[model samples]
Target: GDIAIYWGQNGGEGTLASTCDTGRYAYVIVSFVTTFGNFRAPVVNLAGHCDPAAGTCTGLSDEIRSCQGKDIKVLMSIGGGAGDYSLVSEADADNFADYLWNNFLGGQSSSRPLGDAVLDGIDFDIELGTTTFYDTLARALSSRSTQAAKVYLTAAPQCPHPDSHLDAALNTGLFDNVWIQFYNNPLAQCQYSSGNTNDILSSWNTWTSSTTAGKIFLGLPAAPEAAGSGYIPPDVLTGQILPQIKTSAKYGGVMLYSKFYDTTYSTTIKDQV
Candidate 1:
């Protein structure tokens, strides 16, 4: 099992390279490339980390390469709790993939957003969308696997039985990873309840047993304030939830929300993961 962390959203999270230097995350997914698809030009929103608009994020290329040097995979995430994106047709999805490849993954562009650093892959943090052509986008991206470097696709879907946004994409079976967001769903009706095991296991079984996703990770908020609900103490995660769920072969590991809020969450639970 390997731990993954999302960065670039919170300004206080520190540099992307420092997150990898912690020796905790096997994957560091950059927060978002916010704008794209449905005929809109792409835009990246990294919060206060760097200004992509001013072309000041080229240093991130070096950071990404540094992390990759340690064999840590870095991915550029599309969408998030913010941003507007939609793909109405297969061609639209394919164009979006082309923009991704040209800008981030493994292609050439005069205005490379992250400069010359080639990301390991892309992650779909698509929190909201029409859900129509997501799988088409997945197919388009994976179709580029014959490129210089392999493209790994990952997703973050809410912890419902079938995610409203990414259900079709996950079912495509092209996704290499899925980190089920077990928190912030209208603030915790189906989230991990204290001393409550049924809902957690119930949803866990549904995702692991039903989806053809390569691996599943338990996504959680690192700090109590990081999300509206579903923040588990390290003790609860290790002593109860993990003990109950780790038996499943689909269990990949844990993914914390963002590095800014993670004071000792990983430091406390890294061993168990």
Candidate 2:
């Protein structure tokens, strides 16, 4: 099992190097490419971290390589609650994949957004755009993989049986890692709730059995205030939640929503994971 954390959303969250310096997280996700799809040009929004429009985020290239030296997998995620993106057809998806390969993965591009750093993979954090041609996008990205430097494909799907957005993409059986958001919707049977493990546990069993992905992770908010609900305290998670979920053969580990909320989260539960 390996731990992952999302960064690049909050300006005060600290630098990418600072987060990587901790050496606690095995994977660090640079959150949200924000815009792309259709025939439109791709755009990235890193919130206050940096401005991609002005081409000032390139300094992160060095930091990314620094982290890679430590064997950390740095991934660039696409889509979020905001930012409009969609692929109208398979061709459009292929084009987007080419752009990603040249710019973020194992291809060449002088106009790379995050500079010369080659991200380990592209993470689909698709929350909207029903069926958005993500399966095509997945195949397109995976096709770029080489034996020397493999390109990984990952996803962040809501904990519901079939995520509203990435359901079709996930069914492709090409994803390497899937971090299911076990938070956000308190009313959902998959979300964590105090004193009631039945729903979350059942959902875990379903998620573990349903997906063909290599590993399934429990994605959660790092701090209590990070979300409206579903904040499992470190002790509760390490003692109860991890125990139950770890029973599955597909269990990967835990994924914290954002490093800005709490840097110490992994420290508390990583050993158990």
Candidate 3:
């Protein structure tokens, strides 16, 4: 569900063209490009691409826009390691909810700005801001979306355990999913030496099975096989674990930790998985 999976109209090397070119189907959720910057839009609308307008940004690609009518759904990721909270603390609660509803689910624009945006929902990384900051934001977003119709709202919190600091936030009932990163703890190479997939899956499965079903998505890097795990990895985590997870009924869907998956590793990994 990361953002970088798409964008390279052609591979950087121009080897095969786009990452999706190799695969018949791709489920992309792009994110963390430019938070509240000139090139970026509000972070609340995941899985949708934005075109920078005069001061604010406009939705360029929605879930349906790029999926060509497929199983793919887009979700906006908020509060990355960097304070990419473009929409957070928007004046206050009422204002923030209005921002999320109009831009994300409520169809704020006269035209179908988010054409089949088909947003699965919002994903909160939320490492930058306070938990209270996220709680207020999530509540407003959820309230508005529910009023319009049923929409998906989720978060990719810290691995293994849920955050008690954000317990108030999590209890907002806004979250329909909680994706936890299982790789890159004290030992990366240990798992690497011992087949990293199992290590990663174990942590993720532990949390998901122990807590709730269908709420957790196992996220792996999308660059290279040897990439070291962390908030970010050095190499790309292409096709490494996606194929395995895709077929597994244990997980709901595959989510890459980032949006920018289109470096040298982007195309090849895209195809293989």
Output the better candidate (2/3) by TM-score.
2
* Model 1 segments more than 4 A misplaced: 186-189
lDDT of 1 by residue, 142-261 (tens): 988875679999999999878989998988999998999988874444578677756777788888998898689999999889998888889988988887778888899998898998
Which pairs clash in the backbone of model 2? none
Q: Which 10-residue window of candidate 2 scores lowest in summed lDDT?
A: 262-271
Runs with alpha carbons beyond 4 Å of true place in candidate 3:
1-26, 33-51, 54-59, 62-64, 84-91, 109-120, 146-148, 164-167, 183-202, 210-213, 224-250, 258-273
Ranking by TM-score: 2, 1, 3
Q: List RMSD in Å for every model shown.
A: 1.3, 1.1, 6.7
| Ranking of models by lDDT | 2, 1, 3
TM-score of every model versus the real structure = 0.96, 0.97, 0.61
Error of 2 at 77 (Å): 0.2
lDDT of 3 by residue, 171-260 (tens): 665677666654455453212223344655455545555553344565555554423554224222333555544554445554554334
Of the two candidates 1 and 3, the one with more favorable TM-score, higher being better, is 1
- Residue 5 miss distance in model 1 (angstroms): 0.5
For candidate 1, what is the lDDT?
0.88
